[PDB]
Amino acid sequence: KVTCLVCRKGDNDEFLLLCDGCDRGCHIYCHRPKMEAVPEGDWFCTVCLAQQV
Ligand SMILES: [K+]
Ligand SMILES: [Zn+2]
Ligand SMILES: [Zn+2]
After folding, report:
1. Cα(53)–Cα(28) distance, integer angstroms
2. Residue ranges per structural domain of the chain
3. 2 C-alpha to ligand 1 centroid (Å)
4. Cys-Cys link to 35, which of 5, 21, 25, 31 (CB 3.0-4.6 A)?
5. Which class does domain 1-53 fall in?
6. 3-class DSSP state for residue 38?
7. How far is the CA of 43 from the centre of ligand 3 (A)?
8. Comparing C-alpha atoms, which of 36, 41, 7, 43 is closest to residue 22?
């Protein structure tokens, strides 16, 4: 179900970041700036960042 925002594939799911604000995702290797690992705690996608104040 989860696909990457940048490349639109849902493969290599161990490399797939999952947004804590919605159901969107992103391969760590697709992200810019460089992300060498899935972080702990919370990651927010760009659509969620746009809802912050
Ligand atoms: K939300
Ligand atoms: Zn990707
Ligand atoms: Zn999100």
Report:
1. 26
2. 1-53
3. 16
4. 31
5. alpha beta
6. coil
7. 8
8. 43
Point out the ligand nearest to the CA of residue 18. 3
The per-residue DSSP string of 6-36 comes to TT----SGGGEEE-SSSS-EEETTT-SS---
36/49 Cα distance (integer angstroms): 21
Which resolution in angstroms does this entry have? 1.9
Q: Compute, in angstroms, the gap from residue 35 CA to the centroid of ligand 1.
A: 23
Experimental approach: X-ray
Closest Cα partner for 7 from 39, 31, 23?
31
Closest listed ligand to the CA of 35: 2
At residue 38, what is the residue type?
A: V
Residue 41: DSSP 8-state: S
